[PDB]
Ligand binder design. Structure first.
Ligand SMILES: CCCCC/C=C\C/C=C\CCCCCCCC(=O)O[C@H](COC(=O)CCCCCCCCCCCCCCC)COP(=O)([O-])OCC[N+](C)(C)C
Ligand SMILES: CCCCCCCCCCCCCCCC(=O)O
Ligand SMILES: CCCCCCCCCCCCCCCC(=O)O
Lengths: 1051, 114, 99
């Protein structure tokens, strides 16, 4: 009607003042919060002198204390929790928890006892404990930001963040408890209520937060391309969680918010790839506003109140307090120096000193002091709290925030690594060369010809910010060369996207650890590359116990008596359990009310209906029984779980007619339900316990998910190691000059590669269900990623405009998000599907049927021999299940093969004796296809994509894949881009031999696989299995009945 | 759109053929072929004038793709591209006149007189 | 980014509040002009701030629309149905044609 709020102007003024202060104090080490405090002091003095601005400032000067506790603190707490790195924090759970909790408790108790002893104020223990809890909360954002800028010791930053978060939460909880104890006394209570109160404060919070987080995460995974809905529902969930936890029920709110934020941050994958950026920015700006407002408020309030009643001697006390709060904390670290030395990452004296000097008090202590001062109404309390808190905050901000950089430099942590320095030098050299080339190109233009050339310095040069016995040499230099080669290979794999993140982090960590270690090659595979592959814990035992618990007979016959099949199918339908579950969950309502009435015309209608409630459900259960028993015969009792259904009904009736409604005898006088009923019969609730039967399969899904995550991590690590080792091998082969070093290096590479391959094969054999799901997800991802790259290239080429490309990209990301919700387990495909999927015969059905007609199944026990070296070719073998070890002479190469591999192709195609004896590592089932049968098939099928053609194309690709690596001279083709590029090429038909094959730009490079060739320049004869380089221009075929000449080109 | 989806199908087939030959992702189930599916088309469902007109539209598509490529590089900004493509399609829908006659349609922006 | 976002929000709120309270000028037109001018000169804005601003204003508008619709539903359901006349419905139909 006549509204004119005066709170917007103050928040906007503080907003602008903070913006100016932050912008101005950028290069200077002094934080802008001191400037904010000074500005608040000036504003408070002015408002005291001038009533006009006092009319606007009194709204926040005497602001209600509860808003500080119930709005500002939760916002800062949730903002701190959200920006966390969940994985690194999880990797240091016990250390952070123990350190934070015990240090907080010890510091609070010691500060409290010092406050009672040293200070002359007559304080009891509760107020002293409140004081300690106020001055035991830290927020060192500056220290962790500086450490991240330095780019080293991420563990220190993670530990600092974890300790700060836990300290803030626990300090707030302790302060709340003790403030309620002090300012609002509530008679006396026994230990019975005290234990319940402690349990409600401690445990009931995190459980509620975890439940809400799980519910909202589940609901967040079914929303597609709706950013607004996701953001709005997340905000609503957070606000409702805090409000319900802290108001409707008396549980703690900060802990629930912390747990919810941590859980949501852990499962950020379900969040669409752009929402979390908006959420992070929103929470950051909210925290910034809260900090600015809190600082201005404390400045004004202290400037008035503390300076009304400040004592000269008090200042002296403050000084000692500072020493105390900078000593005890450090002592705590010393008191825990060895305890966490053997647990987790560990600690060192330099890190301990940095941690001790890195504790800066923040806005939490100021808010608590303001609340305490507002609640009190005298001088001995509230004035002293605020004065001491403000003094401590100012002292810490002035001293530590400015001396931390010098302390870091002294301690030898500001140095720059030589590899980083030389990499930066190379990068800036690259940049200068590119800039010079571009400038030389632009000047030669016709339009931008006479432009002024002051851009040469306007664009400037990106200068380096840093500025400023006969064998061990080659041994060490070759070692570091493998380290850089492995690191760049892993980085390239990441940039492609196949290596994920955690696997890359583990690989690079192992690499640099073994590099800094003295004389041992990285990735010895003994233990450092073993835990992730293993992933062993009673997950599998719990899974097996659940499956054996949920067991049933295969099938029940259908008697032709009565209707038979109709009644049987109506009893066995999923609708049956759907309605029984619905009836139970809607029985939770009546069972709740009677209990309510138990713990308690309205009562008349309550007893009229409630009784109607049981007299209908009982009949419904009876109706189920006649269906679940009849058509099942005795089976009624065969299912050991279903026996529970008989009991529920028997108890129901037995305690409804013989225990209730007495008109014949039975209990009569006995003090049973007749005079009871209010109890005993209430057991109706037992009806709820019946759900478990359907609840058991749900836990299997979560166990499968955990095992799936572990298996995926192990597979990614193994793949990455294998790919890095091959690339590193082809690099070292040409880079190194000496021979003995090269042979040793290749030995150490090959041993580890073979061990990892065998371990991965054994693991895949041990867990069949989830391996199939893992392989499927990685393929769908790889395929979708390549499709997205192709779409982007097509849009860039100009054939497609912007909106169609955007639509197709949206479709692709929707498909990826749908993939992300894939089932955790997939049953293994049958041998028929395995035979069908094989590439060189896939597609048409006639050839598939012809092959399936004659392909015998062979079972081989462990430790047998399938194929002997030097034996004539007889056929192939399709590994359906198991592992096989191939040993052969080429350098005596060895290998391991698994499901989906075929080994007969070379011999069956070129009529040559076998060259590799294969033995079996486990029991193995194989598919044997006779050589005569294959000859008949290849003679029968002679279409354009003939069987002969397809087999030779597969063999040619396999043979020619390693050869290109040679021509690769440090070009980094990643072994995958070459495979793709080669897949584009096809095998040409040598219809005529008198012709001469020409070469040109379209066909690039060509490779010969079978036959022989002669140069068209100097009559140079060349055999089949070799490259031809480029020095040839024309290829001359010839008539040779000994071997068929095969040519495979790429265009 | 038909050409784009044909491109997409060819790339998907090539990638599937490449993976099938792997050693690790060798025996994975091949239901991905339909799980990743195919991005189908959403739409679903006198002797001289011939070569004259067909050559005209060929210049139009060539000019349009050249302007789009210049945009994707970034040298052409946005408003210039919009004006160029607008003039192109206007003169294309117009009957028998080559685009950008430079008389008035490409004159006001160059002039900029006030 | 934080400074830019916060100063933009403060500028908008202060503009409307000062225009509509301290002096008696219209507020909606000033906000319209300010928004149009800022949108025209979005080049000075860092290439990621405007996305956040657009999302923020979109979510605010969505919340306002939902709240307004629920409020009008409740208020009409009570008040209009206390004193609704049978003939009035007829009038409404003609009104539709008119508009
Ligand atoms: C992991 C999180 C961090 C670690 C856990 C956090 C905090 C520690 C845990 C639990 C706090 C409760 C026990 C701490 C010591 C207080 C002892 C005590 O006595 O408490 C009781 C709590 O009983 C209650 O009245 C409950 C009533 C409040 C609930 C409202 C309903 C304080 O009330 P009082 O009657 O004694 O008043 C004192 C007056 N006299 C001295 C005459 C007895
Ligand atoms: C940090 C979160 C946002 C803070 C600013 C939003 C408004 C809450 C605090 C300002 C006072 C208005 C609400 C309390 C009631 C009052 O002060 O009369
Ligand atoms: C669409 C902008 C946000 C709307 C919700 C924020 C709070 C404003 C409206 C809710 C009522 C509270 C403020 C008015 C005072 C009152 O209703 O007592």
């Amino acid at each position: 009607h006549a509204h004119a709020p005066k709170v917007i102007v103050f928040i906007s003024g503080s907003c602008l003042f903070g913006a100016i202060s932050r912008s101005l104090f950028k290069k200077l080490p002094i934080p802008y919060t001191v400037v904010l405090l000074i500005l608040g002091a000036i504003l408070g003095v002015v408002a005291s002198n001038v009533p006009l601005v006092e009319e606007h400032t009194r709204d926040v000067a005497h602001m209600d204390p509860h808003v500080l506790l119930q709005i500002f603190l939760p916002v800062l707490i949730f903002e701190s929790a959200f920006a966390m790195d969940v994985h690194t924090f999880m990797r240091s759970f016990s250390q952070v928890c123990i350190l934070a909790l015990f240090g907080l408790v010890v510091a609070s108790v010691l500060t409290a006892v010092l406050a009672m002893n040293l200070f002359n104020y007559n304080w009891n223990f509760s107020e002293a404990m409140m004081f300690g809890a106020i001055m035991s909360a830290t927020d060192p954002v500056a220290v962790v930001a500086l450490l991240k800028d330095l780019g080293a010791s991420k563990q220190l930053g993670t530990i600092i963040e974890g300790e700060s978060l836990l300290n803030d939460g626990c300090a707030i909880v302790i302060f709340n408890v003790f403030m309620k104890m002090v300012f609002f006394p509530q008679l006396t209570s026994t230990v019975g209520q005290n234990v319940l109160y402690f349990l409600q404060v401690a445990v009931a919070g995190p459980l509620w937060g975890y439940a809400v987080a799980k519910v909202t995460v589940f609901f967040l995974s079914h929303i597609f391309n709706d950013a607004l809905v996701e953001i709005t529902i997340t905000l609503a969930a957070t606000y409702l969680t805090y409000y319900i936890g802290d108001i409707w029920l008396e549980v703690s709110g900060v802990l629930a918010v912390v747990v919810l934020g941590l859980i949501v941050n852990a499962e950020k994958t379900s969040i669409s790839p752009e929402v979390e950026v908006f959420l992070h920015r929103f929470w950051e700006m909210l925290a910034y506003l809260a900090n600015t407002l809190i600082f201005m408020m404390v400045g004004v309030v202290v400037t008035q109140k503390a300076l009304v009643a400040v004592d000269k001697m008090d200042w002296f006390y403050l000084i000692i307090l500072y020493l105390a709060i900078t000593i005890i904390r450090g002592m705590v670290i010393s008191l825990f120096s060895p305890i966490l030395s053997r647990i987790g990452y560990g600690l060192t004296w330099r890190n301990a000193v940095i941690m001790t000097w890195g504790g800066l008090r923040g806005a939490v202590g100021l808010a608590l002091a303001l609340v305490v001062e507002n609640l009190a109404g005298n001088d001995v309390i509230g004035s002293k709290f605020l004065f001491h808190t403000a003094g401590i905050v100012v002292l810490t901000l002035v001293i530590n925030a400015t001396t931390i950089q010098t302390l870091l430099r002294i301690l030898g942590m500001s140095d720059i690594s030589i590899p980083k320095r030389l990499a930066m030098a190379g990068a800036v050299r690259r940049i200068h060369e590119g800039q010079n080339r571009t400038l030389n190109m632009l000047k030669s233009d016709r339009f931008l010809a006479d432009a002024d050339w002051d851009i040469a310095t306007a664009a400037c040069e990106i200068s380096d910010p840093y500025s400023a016995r006969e064998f061990a040499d080659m041994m060490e230099e070759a070692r570091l060369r493998m380290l850089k080669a492995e690191k760049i290979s892993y980085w390239k794999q990441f940039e492609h996207g196949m290596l994920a993140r955690e696997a890359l982090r583990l690989l690079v960590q192992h690499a640099e650890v073994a590099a800094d270690e003295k004389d041992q090659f990285i990735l010895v595979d003994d233990l450092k590359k073993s835990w992730q592959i293993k992933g062993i814990y009673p997950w599998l035992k719990r899974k097996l116990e659940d499956l054996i618990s949920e067991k049933k007979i295969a099938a029940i016959p259908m008697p032709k008596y009565k209707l038979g099949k109709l009644m049987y199918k109506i009893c066995h339908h999923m609708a049956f359990e759907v309605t029984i579950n619905i009836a139970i969950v809607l029985n939770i309502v009546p069972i709740i009310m009677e209990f309510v009435v138990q713990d308690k015309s309205s009562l008349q209608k309550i007893e009229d209906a409630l009784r109607i409630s049981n007299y209908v459900f009982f009949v419904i259960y009876a109706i189920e029984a006649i269906v679940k028993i009849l058509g099942l015969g005795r089976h009624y009792i065969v299912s050991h779980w279903n026996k529970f259904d008989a009991f529920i009904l028997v108890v129901a009736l037995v305690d409804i007619i013989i225990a209730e409604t007495l008109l014949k005898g039975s209990i009569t006088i006995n003090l049973s339900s007749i005079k009871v009923v209010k109890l005993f019969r209430l057991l109706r609730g037992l009806r709820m316990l019946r759900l478990t039967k359907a609840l058991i399969p749900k836990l299997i899904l979560v166990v499968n998910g955990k095992i799936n995550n572990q298996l995926s991590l192990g597979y990614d690590v193994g793949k990455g190691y294998i790919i890095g080792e091959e690339e590193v091998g082809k690099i070292i082969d040409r880079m190194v000059d000496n021979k003995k070093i090269l042979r040793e290096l290749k030995h150490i590479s090959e041993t580890g590669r073979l061990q990892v391959v065998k371990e991965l094969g054994l693991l895949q054999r041990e867990h069949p269900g989830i391996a199939v799901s893992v392989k499927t997800r990685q393929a769908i991802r790889t395929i979708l990623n390549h499709s997205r790259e192709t779409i982007h290239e097509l849009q860039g080429a100009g054939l497609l405009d912007e909106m169609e490309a955007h639509k197709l990209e949206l479709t692709v990301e929707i498909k990826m998000k749908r993939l992300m919700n894939a089932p955790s387990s997939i049953p293994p495909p049958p041998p028929e599907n395995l035979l069908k999927n094989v590439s060189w015969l896939a597609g048409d059905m006639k050839l598939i049927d012809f092959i399936k007609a004659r392909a015998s199944l062979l079972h081989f026990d462990y430790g047998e021999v399938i194929v002997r070296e030097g034996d004539e070719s007889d056929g192939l073998f399709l590994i359906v299940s198991g592992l096989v070890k191939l040993y052969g002479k080429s350098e005596v190469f060895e290998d391991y093969l698994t499901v989906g591999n075929v080994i007969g192709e070379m011999g069956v195609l070129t009529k040559k004796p076998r060259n590799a004896t294969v033995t079996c590592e486990t029991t193995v089932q194989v598919y044997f296809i006779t050589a005569e049968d294959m000859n008949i098939a290849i003679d029968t099928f002679t279409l354009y994509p003939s069987l002969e053609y397809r087999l030779w194309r597969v063999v040619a690709i396999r043979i020619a894949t390693p050869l290109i690596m040679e021509q690769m001279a440090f070009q980094g083709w990643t072994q995958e881009k070459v495979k793709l590029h080669l897949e584009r090429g096809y095998l040409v038909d040598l219809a005529e031999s008198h012709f001469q094959f020409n070469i040109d730009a379209t066909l690039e490079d060509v490779i010969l696989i079978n036959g022989t060739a002669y140069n068209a320049h100097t009559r140079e004869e060349i055999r089949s299995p070799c490259l031809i380089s480029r020095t040839v221009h024309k290829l001359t075929f010839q008539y040779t009945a000994t071997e068929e000449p095969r040519l495979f080109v790429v265009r």
